[PDB]
Design a protein around this nucleic acid. Structure first.
Lengths: 137, 173, 385, 125, 267, 125
RNA sequence: CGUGGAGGUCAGUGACGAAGCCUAGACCGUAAGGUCGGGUCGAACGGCCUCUAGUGCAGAUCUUGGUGGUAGUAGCA
RNA sequence: AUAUUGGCGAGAGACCGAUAGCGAACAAGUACAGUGAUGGAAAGAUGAAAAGAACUUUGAAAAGAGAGUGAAAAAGUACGUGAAAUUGUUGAAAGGGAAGGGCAUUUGAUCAGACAUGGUGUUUUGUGCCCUCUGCUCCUUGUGGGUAGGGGAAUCUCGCAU
């Protein structure tokens, strides 16, 4: 339901496409708080991003073991854009009058932009996770 | 002549043929018996030529002599055909006296199908159908599709129920 | 101007007091000086037909079965003189609802099939009236010298009757009709005790499909009698009628019992009602009743109502002349009238009174009443300062 | 049909012309007609339109709105009309561009040379 | 030219965004000093939405609509020869409307003859659903004697609640117009006036443009001023057309896309 | 009609060789021409090529499932040529005929007894 | 069988949506192809009888334009 | 009288329709490259009207989010239609060192699938182009066409509704 979601686009972004595909997918379907915290931890080298498609010559680390992968890296610039976005999406939702505590990145998505440059659009979309229910006899 | 009208219109253009996908041809000359453009079936090649038409509910037997070729206005020579199908067929056979069994019959035929289309009354008495065809214009099929998405958004039903639940069960305790 | 507005959902009369140019739909525009409810007698008893007699006297008819006479009185409340309404006397129980609920073994469509009055009009300065009902009953009501009404004679007609129209072109008579109940001419006596059917209409020859053409005349007017040699045996009565079935039909009795011209006004045989005579220049061409004062059909022009939202104008030949307020009316129209020949009084189910100028086809007054209007009458058009 | 040889019928030569017509040629190209009352008082169909004349608009969304012409923006072949205005969301009034063939003159702005224009065309003031 | 323009109204839209955003920082800095000046931006500078800029009796209740004294027996039916989806719509109406005796429509029986049947067996309402293509579209609500009679265009429909057999609470939203509180005056009647509170089910009828939405829910409370709710029942919309006044004869309203040219109005 | 049982002979589409491998080469049938080609030499397992034997029974040709020959009707005059062949031809209303016009072609064809192959075209309820 | 234009014709179709584009959609024709429904769309187009031609593509280390894998690789002294 | 790819000015076309047509429909012999003689592109279409998105909000900036104008932003000065390659997301399916193809079926998902409703033979009535009384008019041959006024069904299925 659109009355429940807030989106935040960003376009023509001078970021490596390939890295973004990763940090996005990494964060796909996470409770916004646990999600934002995780991007701090990649910044501090606590946790790494499970690179999966575009991953040739990524040096294996234990931090990959969290996910199911051996290869994983810490990319700054990418994530810098993605938490920049999430921060925005959060604020959109607060204008829309939502519960931020239930929130989660329902659909994030990244596709290339016009061009040498290699720029890239991003659109993440966050949603209230709907619960709260009861019955009678 | 006629055998020289035919083979010109037959090939070299009878500017009222319909080529069916079938290959079949169809003289749409509002006068012919069989809808098909065919020698001894086109009212243009052939010079003696009959038909039934309707006008109102009045079914006439038009006939075209070859005497009258000089004078294209008084070409057809029509006759009201009774309206008891039984007398009507006898009515027909009377006039066709001594023509090509083609007409002699194909007219009886036209006559029938046209009569068994006084079955419009059968659609128009047992009408009263609560349906009637509505055109969908594709402008409307936007204004009435792109405006709902906007209403829903501007509605926000949840916050409305939230209001008119709290505001209900604060004065119904 | 001043108006008497028949209401149904409150069941009353609303007094309308405004200027020319008044609109209840624009806030920056003119607001009407007064709008007051009077005689709120409920949804079960609403006024069908009114008659205005003079300055301080008007006669009504309710859907309970009643016929009321009301004295009007003016007083003050800038410097506007509103009206007070007081029922003098009432003649009650005049419907015969049982005659209807037996006839319509599915005629067309009405599950409750309530009886009302079709006409409330004078007969001949006379103090004498005629009220006709769909049940077939005609009631002759006279106003007594003591300002108290008395019913003189109750007469019966072959129901159902959807209209009745008198004849006041001396140069007593009337003509009536309803659903599958053809147009018929009735001469009545000066005692009002005797009715006689001088002439009955014949329906036209079948159409293409040889089906019978439906007869359902909704309204009729008269035109001043035919000139020429008056044939013996045949009567002289020119009168046009309208049907539900989009037929504007035109009968001259002198010519014959079928109408000389049955004319379909619209496609699909659209439902039509109310035959209002008007002139193209905003003039009066008609009697106090409403029949056309002319010896020929071709000078005649008619405003009519449909059951969608459209109020049409036609000539005596069917040529469509123009929709009235094609824009502003959105609901059905119940009641149209050609006041003075220079104004229109339209107000249907969209619950607005609309006053239209005849000449420029332009809305003058739009007044929200909140009830479905079923009748309007103007009283005066003198402006207020 | 085209009888003279001096006149071309070519669409290319024609459009080009109209879209490059200098201001004075354009002056003629914007000819409102006169309303039926003035076509009788003046015995003439149509004039080139100037500033402070009254106009009533026929065709378009601004149907039956009458005004008094503000400016003949001849560059854009249009006539900004006072009161016939659109409202932008910042509250600022913006003048709608009507076009002289869709307007109609209700009241003229008479001058010496404009009186002489009517006298030229067969008028009677 | 194109490529001048393309490198102009790019740079201008790079000048303007800076100038715009600078203007908001120097705004935000003196907002930390003075809150009072911020309040004066919010009196003057309006959002100007479509709702802000909208363009501008008890005897009725028992005679035309159904009331709290009777059980409203209601006669559901489908359009001649309808398919699975139509019946897949019946069951939705069977759950939500009261003593709906669904019936199959059996050709002929024009309409007045139907009324005669429904007078006899003594119904309150006729409700009739239609399909053009394999989708449900039209929905009619006729009141059986006299007959104030509506017709609607469902747009939406869909299918995680699994509702109880407790009777659901009504709510209605935005109806200032008298044509509105006639449709308000419809549904008030056509759905139950029973509701048992316990079971905590709520059917809504929020109108916001002229698009009337309809949803069902499951409200639950916390003593901390807020109320949660889970989606239940069918998704939907309607749109009024007609209003016939007579059983079918006459009109009153009838949507024409002539409206829609208006961008506001609403009813 | 008590039509014969319509034999279809070959129901699969005759695709072009390799129209599956390359996106440039199209599903529109074209003969192979290289003399080293297997398709042209009709080796086993390789795609079936259109030959004249697949030709349909002349009695049943053009006949649609309904057992009517398709026939395009533009307007209500063109329809009324089949006044005599309702048992044999099916009035395909043509694709560009509008909404407002169609509803009229359906009125007649229902009345005449012509089975329209494509009703519910543009039309709703 | 198909494409651009010409003459002729269908008192042809057409903002109640021409053409184009899609389409896990239908029909026809051995096939070249033709027709229809649904979606997008926004201003012109089609059959028939004949004319005419800068007329039909898988390739030419084709010509131009656009985009991949190579690769986040070699690489940034 | 004849010549005439220049110049000055017209009128034309079974010509081309933006990778065509002059190189060039547009800041074109322009930008640009070369020491120089020279070489030399690419690039058309918002909309009817800028009504080009006010105002609130997130960000030092780049862009977003609400909200609105417009018939349409499924028309945003990256602007008519918007193909294909190719790319992301989601859903389904398959995957033990090859995939796509042909013949045939299975399963899964999915799409169609009559505003079909009579036909015939009888029987009540009621009407009309029916019977019958009186006509009026267009024309070419009897085997004519159009259309009024009355009356009447107790004869008549002649038609059509019940």
């Amino acid at each position: 339901n659109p009355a429940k979601s807030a989106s935040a686009r960003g376009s023509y972004l001078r970021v490596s496409f390939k890295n973004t595909r990763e940090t996005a997918q990494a964060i796909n379907g996470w409770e916004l708080t646990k999600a934002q915290k995780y991007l701090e931890q990649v910044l501090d080298h606590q946790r790494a991003i499970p690179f999966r498609r575009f991953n040739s010559s990524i040096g294996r680390t234990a931090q990959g073991k969290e996910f199911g992968v051996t290869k994983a890296r810490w990319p700054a610039k990418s994530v810098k854009f993605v938490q920049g976005l999430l921060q925005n999406a959060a604020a959109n939702a607060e204008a829309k009058g939502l519960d931020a505590t239930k929130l989660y990145v329902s659909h994030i998505q990244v596709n290339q932009a016009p061009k040498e440059s290699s720029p890239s659009h991003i659109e993440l979309v966050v949603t209230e996770k709907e619960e709260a229910v009861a019955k009678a006899a | 002549s006629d055998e020289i009208v035919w083979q010109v219109i037959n090939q070299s253009f009878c500017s009222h043929r319909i080529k069916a996908p079938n290959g079949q041809n169809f003289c749409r000359n509002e006068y012919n018996v069989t809808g098909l453009c065919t020698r001894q079936s086109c009212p243009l090649a052939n010079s003696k030529y009959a038909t039934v038409k309707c006008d109102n509910g009045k079914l006439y037997l038009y006939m075209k002599t070859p005497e009258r070729a000089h004078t294209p206005a008084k070409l057809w020579e029509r006759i009201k055909l009774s309206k008891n199908y039984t007398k009507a067929l006898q009515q027909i056979d009377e006039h066709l006296l001594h023509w090509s069994k083609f007409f002699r019959h194909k007219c009886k035929q036209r006559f029938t199908k046209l009569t068994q289309v006084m079955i419009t009354e059968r659609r128009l008495a047992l009408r009263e159908e609560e349906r009637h065809y509505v055109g969908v214009a594709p402008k409307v099929k936007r204004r009435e599709q792109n405006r709902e998405r906007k209403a829903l958004v501007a509605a926000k039903i949840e916050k409305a129920i939230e209001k008119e639940l709290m505001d209900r069960l604060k004065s119904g305790a | 101007m001043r108006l008497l507005v028949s209401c149904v959902d409150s069941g009353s009369i609303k007094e309308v007091l405004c200027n020319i140019g008044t609109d209840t739909s624009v806030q920056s525009a003119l607001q009407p000086f007064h709008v007051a409810p009077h005689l709120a007698e409920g949804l079960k008893a609403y006024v069908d037909r009114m008659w205005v007699i003079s300055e301080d006297e008007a006669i009504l008819a309710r859907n309970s079965g009643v016929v009321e006479l009301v004295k009007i009185s003016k007083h003050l409340k800038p410097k506007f003189d509103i009206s007070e309404f007081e029922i003098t006397s009432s003649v009650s129980d005049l419907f015969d609802d049982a005659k209807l609920e037996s006839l319509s073994s599915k005629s067309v469509k009405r599950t409750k099939l309530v009886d009302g009055f079709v006409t409330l009009c004078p007969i001949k300065s006379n103090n004498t009236f005629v009220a006709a009902t769909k049940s077939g009953l005609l009631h002759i009501i006279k106003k007594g010298e003591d300002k108290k009404l008395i019913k003189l004679a109750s007469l019966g007609l072959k129901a159902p009757v959807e209209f009745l129209q008198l004849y006041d072109l001396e140069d007593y008579i009337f003509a009536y009709g309803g659903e599958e109940n053809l147009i018929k001419l009735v001469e009545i006596d000066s005692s009002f005790q005797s009715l006689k059917q001088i002439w009955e209409a014949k329906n036209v020859k079948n159409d293409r499909l040889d089906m019978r053409v439906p007869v359902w005349p909704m309204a009729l007017r008269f035109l001043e009698p035919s000139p020429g040699k008056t044939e013996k045996g045949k009567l002289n009565y020119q009168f046009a009628a309208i049907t539900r079935w989009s037929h504007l039909t035109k009968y001259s009795t002198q010519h014959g019992r079928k109408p000389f011209a049955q004319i379909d006004l619209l496609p699909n045989r659209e439902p039509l009602s109310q035959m209002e005579v008007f002139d193209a220049k905003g003039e009066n061409v008609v009697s106090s009743l409403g029949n056309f004062q002319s010896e020929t059909f071709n000078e005649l022009n008619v405003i009519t109502t449909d059951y969608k939202k459209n109020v049409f104008k036609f000539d005596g030949n069917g040529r469509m002349l123009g929709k009235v307020g094609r824009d502003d009316i959105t609901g059905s129209s119940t009641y149209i009238h050609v006041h003075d020949g220079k104004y229109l009084l339209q107000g249907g189910l969209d619950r607005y009174v609309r006053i239209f100028d005849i000449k420029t086809n332009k809305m003058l007054v739009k007044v929200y009443v909140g009830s479905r209007i079923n009748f309007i009458v103007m009283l005066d058009d003198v402006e207020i300062e | 049909a085209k009888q003279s040889l001096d006149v071309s019928s070519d669409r290319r030569k024609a459009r080009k012309a109209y879209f490059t017509a200098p201001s004075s040629q354009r002056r003629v190209l914007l000819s409102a007609p006169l309303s039926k009352e003035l076509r009788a008082q003046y015995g003439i169909k149509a004039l080139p339109i100037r500033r402070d004349d009254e106009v009533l608009v026929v065709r378009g969304s601004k149907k039956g709105q009458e005004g008094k012409i503000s400016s003949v923006y001849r560059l854009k072949f249009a006539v900004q009309v006072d009161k016939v205005t659109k409202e932008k969301v910042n509250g600022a009034s913006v003048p709608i561009n009507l076009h002289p063939s869709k307007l109609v003159i209700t009241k003229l702005h008479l001058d010496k040379d404009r009186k002489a224009l009517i006298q030229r065309k067969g008028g009677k003031l | 030219n194109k490529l001048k323009r393309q490198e102009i109204f790019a740079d201008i839209k790079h000048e303007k965004n800076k100038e715009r955003h600078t203007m908001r920082r120097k705004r935000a800095k003196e907002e930390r000093e003075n809150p009072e000046l911020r309040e004066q931006r919010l009196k003057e500078n309006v959002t100007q939405t479509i709702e802000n800029t909208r363009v501008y009796e008890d005897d009725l209740m028992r005679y035309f609509n159904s009331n709290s004294n009777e059980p409203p027996k209601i006669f559901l039916t489908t359009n001649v020869n309808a398919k699975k989806s139509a019946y897949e719509f019946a069951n939705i109406l069977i759950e939500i409307l009261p003593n709906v005796t669904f019936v199959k429509r059996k050709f002929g029986y024009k309409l007045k003859e139907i009324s005669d049947i429904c007078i006899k067996r003594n119904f309150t309402d006729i409700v009739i659903i239609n399909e053009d293509k394999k989708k449900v579209t039209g929905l009619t609500f006729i009141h059986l004697p006299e007959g104030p009679t509506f017709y609607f265009k469902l747009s939406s429909f869909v299918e995680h609640g699994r509702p109880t057999s407790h009777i659901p609470e009504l709510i209605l939203n935005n109806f200032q117009t008298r044509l509105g509180q006639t449709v308000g005056r419809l549904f008030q009647s056509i759905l139950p006036q029973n509701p048992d509170i316990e079971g905590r089910q709520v059917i809504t009828l929020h109108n916001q443009r002229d698009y009337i939405f309809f949803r069902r829910h499951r409200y639950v409370f916390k003593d901390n001023e807020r109320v949660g709710l889970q989606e239940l029942g069918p998704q939907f919309t309607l749109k009024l057309k007609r209003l016939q006044r007579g059983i079918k004869e006459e009109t009153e309203w009838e949507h024409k896309p002539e409206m829609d040219k208006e961008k506001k109005k609403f009813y | 009609l008590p039509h014969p049982k319509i034999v279809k002979k070959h129901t699969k589409k005759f695709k072009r060789h390799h129209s599956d491998r390359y996106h440039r080469v199209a599903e529109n049938w074209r003969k192979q021409k290289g003399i080293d080609s297997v398709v042209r030499r009709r080796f086993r397992g390789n795609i079936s090529q259109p030959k004249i034997g697949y030709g349909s029974n002349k009695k049943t040709k053009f006949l649609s499932p309904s057992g009517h020959k398709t026939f395009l009707v533009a307007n209500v005059k063109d329809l009324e040529t089949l006044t005599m062949h309702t048992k044999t031809y099916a009035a395909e209303i043509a694709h560009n005929i509008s909404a407002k016009n169609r509803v009229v072609i359906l009125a007649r064809a229902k009345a005449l007894g012509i089975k329209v192959t494509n009703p519910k075209g543009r039309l709703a309820l």
